[model samples]
Target: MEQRITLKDYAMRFGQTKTAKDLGVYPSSINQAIHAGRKIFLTINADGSVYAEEVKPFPS
Candidate 1:
């Protein structure tokens, strides 16, 4: 089973990726996709790209 992540995870990972990008170690597309909503917290690709997913419904 795949583990799901949240927006905060994306933010935190992006932050780290940004630091690496500044050092010319990470790709700029990662940050761009996050801002453009092309990538998100869930639905991660093998390359680390992601897509936003709707929250699942819960029953009381």
Candidate 2:
């Protein structure tokens, strides 16, 4: 089963200790993203810079 992690739960997974507002989003949306099988992508640029981006579900 896909992990049914809420926004609060997801934030803490990455060591986030504040409320979802501290993460710049509502608490419910995180759960929505989790339900949608959205994965956080880390992109490395040519200069060795890394960026975190969220990709939406496509062709559904």
Candidate 3:
């Protein structure tokens, strides 16, 4: 799944809370991003840094 895509034609209609706010956001981040423009859609997945790991960090 390519998480990095634009809000349009991909968001599945979840809206700002789904796409941008998934980004947590600019409630300030929200307004500044949405309706304002492309910068928002630039980040398709807000928490792109998130990952799923089966193992622990380490055993030191």
Candidate 4:
């Protein structure tokens, strides 16, 4: 089963180093997505590129 995470989790796991800037989106966008009940997934690739996904997670 995949574990679900929140904004706080992301920050804790990845740290506050240029998160929004690296993700190519504003910090408010992340807050908006969370408050709007939008699922957000962030991944840091091996090449240092950040990826963002907005979708619902399947029941764990």
lDDT of each: 0.51, 0.49, 0.43, 0.63
**TM-score per candidate, in order?**
0.37, 0.40, 0.35, 0.53
Clashing pairs in 1: none
Note each model's CA RMSD in angstroms.
9.2, 8.5, 11.0, 5.8
* Positional deviation of residue 12's Cα in model 2 after best superposition, in angstroms: 5.7
> Residue by residue across 1-60, what tens digits does model 4's lDDT show?
244455545656665556667677787876566567676676656665666777776774
lDDT of 3 by residue, 1-60 (tens): 425454442345565555545544544544454445543233333545422112223573
- Model 1 Cα shift for residue 3 (angstroms): 5.4
lDDT, candidate 1, at 57: 37
Best by TM-score: 4
Model 2 spans > 4 angstroms off: 1-19, 41-52, 57-60
Model 4 poorest 10 in a row by lDDT: 1-10
* lDDT (Cα, tens digit) per residue for candidate 1, span 23-54: 34345654565456542346556666555554
lDDT order of candidates, top first = 4, 1, 2, 3
What is the C-alpha lDDT profile of model 2 across 14-54, one tens digit per residue?
53433334445566765565567677543435553334456
Candidate 4 regions off by >4 Å? 1-8, 13-17, 56-60
Stretches > 4 Å off in candidate 1: 1-3, 16-41, 56-60
How are the candidates ranked when ordered by TM-score, highest leading? Answer: 4, 2, 1, 3
